[PDB]
Amino acid sequence: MADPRDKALQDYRKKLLEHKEIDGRLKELREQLKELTKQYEKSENDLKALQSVGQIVGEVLKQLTEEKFIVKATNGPRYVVGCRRQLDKSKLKPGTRVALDMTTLTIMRYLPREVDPLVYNMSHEDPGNVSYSEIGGLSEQIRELREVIELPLTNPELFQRVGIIPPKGCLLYGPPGTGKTLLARAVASQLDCNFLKVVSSSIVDKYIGESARLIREMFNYARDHQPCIIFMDEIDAIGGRRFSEGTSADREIQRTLMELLNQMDGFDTLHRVKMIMATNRPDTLDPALLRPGRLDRKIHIDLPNEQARLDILKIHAGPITKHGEIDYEAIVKLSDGFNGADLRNVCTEAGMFAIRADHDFVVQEDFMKAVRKVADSKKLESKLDYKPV
Amino acid sequence: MPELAVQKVVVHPLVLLSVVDHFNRIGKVGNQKRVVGVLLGSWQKKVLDVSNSFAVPFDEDDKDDSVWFLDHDYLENMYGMFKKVNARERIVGWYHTGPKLHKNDIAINELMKRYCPNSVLVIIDVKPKDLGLPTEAYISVEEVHDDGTPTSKTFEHVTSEIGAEEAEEVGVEHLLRDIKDTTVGTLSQRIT
Amino acid sequence: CTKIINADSEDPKYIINVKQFAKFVVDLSDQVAPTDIEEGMRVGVDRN
Amino acid sequence: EQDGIGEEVLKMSTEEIVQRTRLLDSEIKIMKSEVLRVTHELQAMKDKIKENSEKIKVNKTLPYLVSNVIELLDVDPNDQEEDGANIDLDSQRKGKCAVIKTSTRQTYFLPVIGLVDAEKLKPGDLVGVNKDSYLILETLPTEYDSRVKAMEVDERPTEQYSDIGGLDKQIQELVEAIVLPMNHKEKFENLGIQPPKGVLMYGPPGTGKTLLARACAAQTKATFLKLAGPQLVQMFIGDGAKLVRDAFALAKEKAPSIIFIDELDAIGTKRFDSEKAGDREVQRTMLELLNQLDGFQPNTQVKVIAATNRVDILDPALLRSGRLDRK
Amino acid sequence: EFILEQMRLCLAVKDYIRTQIISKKINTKFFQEENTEKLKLKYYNLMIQLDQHEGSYLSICKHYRAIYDTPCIQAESDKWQQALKSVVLYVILAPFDNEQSDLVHRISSDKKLEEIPKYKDLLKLFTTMELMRWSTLVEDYGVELRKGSSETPATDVFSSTEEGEKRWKDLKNRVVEHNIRIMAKYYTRITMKRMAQLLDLSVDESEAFLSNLVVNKTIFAKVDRLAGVINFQRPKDPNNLLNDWSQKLNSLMSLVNKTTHLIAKEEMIHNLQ
């Protein structure tokens, strides 16, 4: 190369390089061999999966002693099973899922408590939230709710000093569109914990008393994973009355209703799980359910007031791109007739008019159009969710 | 290589019977020339279940204990077949047919360790040793003694017991033409 | 045959409803036409 | 490699390097013999594997049951919690395992395939499982019934907008409202608005309320779900309600998409209080619908067309915005 | 800041109790942080005086120790000598029971503790079970504990401060009761008289220590005023002797059968030799 000695070295080097090419051949064959071992372990473990069946899952009905456990198997017939000694009997105790064998009928192992796929859909959902207030200035009523639900659950210590009986639950009623469901999201927004937003139009089942038992499984789940606030949605059919001189649906609503009563207070008291119920029509529910002393606050949410309408526009105005206007405020205040859901819709529907014209901007003319349109549509269907005023 | 996956060694009645039966089959050797064979059994467990054994033709001389024959080729080929039988059957270690261990056994152990992932040398005896265990299990250990001995490779004992499997246990009763005055279930048995 | 779903990896997949009311996915007939297995069509499938 | 460095000069003589070259000639030939050995070792390992493969092959093919994933346990490939005794480890020990709740209405805790592990399958999948001994061979897409098939995307024909003359203004509102936020979601965001949660078309029968929507949607090319309100109601109690929830979920995956709902007195009954009727089941399908429109995002992407020829049985919430933005 | 201000003004008038409860309600986490560090120092320094007067021993150990850990005190050589030794002194002062024994382990673990030879030696008697004399302990106590420290030229607040003397007296009761604890478990029976020779304190003083000890329930004793005997761990039932007798025989059988397995290997010979 750069030394006359490096030139001599270079002729020798070729032979060292040659020796590596012969090793290369050997090396290819090893390369496949390194992969072949990973696949070996995988397949050997796979044979053990193939001879092994999909063993019966069960639950412990009653543990009499270590050697005799009664199980409710998922195939149907309840069995007497044994246990292996490589397990602690404390884990396996009743109300807990356990694995069962199918080769021998013995409890294989401990499985943690389990929840249905239905409960997963309900646990996932929450977003679309608002920061704190449904509507600003009304904020005092909102705080009261917060005071009821959040605090005792997180920290009981404050309630202990005072010596008082803690606040329990909230029942929400108000007109359709006011923002009852949004409040449910709102409390969730700030806190950021485990949530079960439980739709009650999927707890229901064709069999009777399976739906009641189900709701109960969700309450248990919320306790394990505290903090939790359970938002009950659409209880105009999971809460009702006795009924039952008709369909198979009618026996079913009364049963599901029984569960909501116990949880509110009838042997189980709200401290470990807290519930806010958002209801369309409060006269659907039970005369028992309403009764105060298993509910603390019964909050009535009011529709927008004159000054209350302005602040909501102010939050909407940030998302929307306009020419550099802020015109919405004055026009809404003189007019009348909005509920919370309609106010966000004047801003959404002005945005639609702009898009037809082609603008990324919303003009003062668009907004005007929306106010007339929304009022017009109310007139056709003034058949809103009946509450006497 | 690891000798790890053992804290206990249980051995089936099958293991013993296979060695006496196999002696006739091979050559009618009869412990004239000691035999070493593969010890087969389970893995992925702390406890070692020796399910099975097969003989390998190994003759060790009685002129000399440093010379032996051990048929290597049989081991690789028998390997693929074990999976046809069950996928819990793999080579755990080796067996010595006794009457006793040797120093020579360390050398026999190094060859067998390449195949196994948990090699152990378990002496299953062709003669039953007393009314006690006819098996003793040992594992190769590097240790010093304060006797003024530097590093040795020797055999230190690990606890041996006799176990059984559900299929096998039933089969044993049927085969048996003894009734058992040594059952040890009750007062009558207990006094004996 | 209840429904036609393709994620084919052998021969065309169909989900059938057995009369023990377990759903099973089966595949294109052993020799008969794919044009004879349709949605809302009856099919004979092996018991074993 | 080692040579052709300046360090080599210092360390060694020239004579050492030439002598090393002479040794190399013999060394390469030996390495060539070694080629034959390596190939030989590779085949022996493979043979064990080949034995194993025969077993995997049959299970993978037919028959296979259809099931859902309840939960994920996992316990690694035959490591477990050391539950292995002197009872079999091919009939007790499981590999990396998944808990599944099957469609029969049983549960099985099962050993999944060692090659493609249990960790990969998450809760919510619709999977095949082996009938004999349970293993999850592979995954199957969303598969259920013939009612569910219609809901899955495949365009619905054009009946043309040039079948109705006049009422021009109304046509412009439908094409803007439904078709544009679906493709052009970027623009709805750019302006600053959420894409609708739907449009309600109301009026007297025969005007062409349905006529325009179906016609325009094919022409533009769209991802078309065919949902019918009376279909969603069923004779089993609140099973019907679950279907709505699932049907919308189907739209959310596919997103953005337009769900055409033909008619809305069967998931738009007016009633929130009733007794002694088939209206009890009908009310629940309607209530689940209200919830699906409410905000949880990817469900502002997906659009909704609902139609009525009446107003004297329309559900006020669904008419009200924030369920269906446009009227 | 709030607790800091309030604690100082109430300290001047002398009202320890009202602030002291409040300080615990505020979570312990807040004080530890670097941002708060400057306040933390001030806050604790006040608090340690406050709790001292109250006589809450357990609380001083914690407070001084929180101080010890904080980054500036650890980093600088001087600062930790006073803070950690203060914990070491409060830990001996704390009620003689299980809490005391648990705290002595914690301090002794500290690497910083171990480098001082004096204090290392001092812990080593408490840590042992070998019988440790009051006479020896006292000369060792003179140099180390009374001034606070002896490995830096500073006074640590423990003894020779206005509250400090108050605590020192108790220190005598703690050490003697500890000497008794270690001793009590080994000796089933001792005469009152012999115990005095062992403690290097009179029979009357030992009697009073045991009265306090039995109440804490560190070890049960029966003590007589007759002077006959002090009995530790004896019920005076034949039941004890019957169960004890059985246990020794039960282990023994097990031993013989295991030993012979290894023996079998030795026995073979001409392969070892």
Next chain:
Amino acid sequence: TFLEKTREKVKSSDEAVILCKTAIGALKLNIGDLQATKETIEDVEEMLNNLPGVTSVHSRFYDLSSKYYQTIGNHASYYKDALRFLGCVDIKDLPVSEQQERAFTLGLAGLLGEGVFNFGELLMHPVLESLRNTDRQWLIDTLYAFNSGDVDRFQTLKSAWGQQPDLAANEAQLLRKIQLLCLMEMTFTRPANHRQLTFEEIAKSAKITVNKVELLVMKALSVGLVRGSIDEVDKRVHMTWVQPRVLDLQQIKGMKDRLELWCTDVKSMELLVEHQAQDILT
């Protein structure tokens, strides 16, 4: 620097890698880099240990670690490390001189300790035993006295001790320690039939007052040489248990005697057990 340089490649398989590592440890120790010596000593110690083939190499390395402990002057730590050398000992490939210095220092070192006892082990190895000098003749007789567990033999030797001042400073500690050992030694050796000891025996032997022995006996139990209870009013310390001890001269003899008593009883007893209960005996 040079030692490290040589460590490169290998012909086939030759053990040469480790030798260079041990040699760098030896070099470190002389120079005065103690810390460095230590880290390399830890690495080699594993590599050597694994093979059965290393006799000699492992032993020089072990001597090297004992040298580091000795330089500090902390005797307790020194004695322990030295023990690993005593097990590994061999005279071959180990210089006569390094061994000689180490053995004399060690002999002194164990005695100085507060709670280390392996005197029986020392008798067993020729490295300390065969090694003899003027000073060494008395020092081995003191180790022997210790091994048997006799307070009185040990203490009579006291005049000789003074030749070493080390022994003279902690003479007090040394006499108490023999006695502490005696509790363990006497109970395992002389009584098969009993296991209790009086205080008075210790007292005369030690020629130490009665008041002290009760206190010494308490320390004995705390170390764990003996476990049991002490009953003051009966003037006995009863041993439930005796600590295992490394092979001693007195010991081996007692074990044989007790095994003989045991064989004989088991044969007599076997006849009684068999003789009665005839109808169940089959």
